[PDB]
Design a protein around this ligand. Structure first.
Ligand code: HEM
Length: 148
């Protein structure tokens, strides 16, 4: 695939500094869908504002976890079937946390925004298409966690 190469090349730029980039992803996400903010319940407390989340070590650790799952998907882009069972359980966990299926599309748009802003001119419509497809496939596996 030429898509798989576009993904690997674009990810190299981002994975240089995963917290900085994942911070962008989450800041964008809460800008679009502020109702996701209460789902992060560290020590039984909710964040009042999006900027509160950025001072939480647990929240920042979650950004790292996110970037690592995406790294795994990129590493396995040629065959994502090997992550399917893991992603299904990840889906189930997030359903339990309170993430709705519809919110995954917002996460996807936030990921695309982060890529667009990091790559600028290098974020070509083919790169965008490749990432939408990869992310779509991740979500599809995760959505198998919603059957019950
Ligand atoms: C709306 C988006 C999301 C919300 C509200 C959310 C919320 C949470 C919460 C509350 C936890 C449990 C506490 C913690 O470990 O920090 C969690 C765990 C986790 N999240 Fe997310 N999350 C989101 C998106 C994602 C995405 C997109 C990924 C990866 C693609 C991801 C990967 C993880 C991982 C790997 C864990 C640890 C799961 C485990 O093994 O127990 N999360 N998430």
């Amino acid at each position: 695939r030429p898509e798989s190469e576009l993904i690997r090349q674009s990810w190299r730029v981002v994975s240089r500094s995963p917290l900085e980039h994942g911070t962008v992803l989450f800041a964008r996400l809460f800008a679009l869908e502020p109702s996701l903010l209460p789902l992060f319940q560290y020590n039984g407390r909710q964040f009042s504002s999006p900027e509160d989340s950025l001072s939480s070590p647990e929240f920042l650790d979650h950004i790292r976890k996110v970037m690592l799952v995406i790294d795994a998907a990129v590493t396995n882009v040629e065959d994502l079937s090997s992550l399917e069972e893991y992603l299904t359980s990840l889906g189930r966990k997030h359903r339990a946390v309170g993430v709705r299926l519809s919110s995954w599309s917002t996460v996807g748009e936030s990921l695309l925004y982060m890529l667009e802003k990091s790559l600028g001119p290098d974020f070509t419509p083919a790169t965008r298409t490749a990432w939408s497809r990869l992310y779509g496939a991740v979500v599809q596996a995760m959505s198998r966690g919603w059957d019950g």
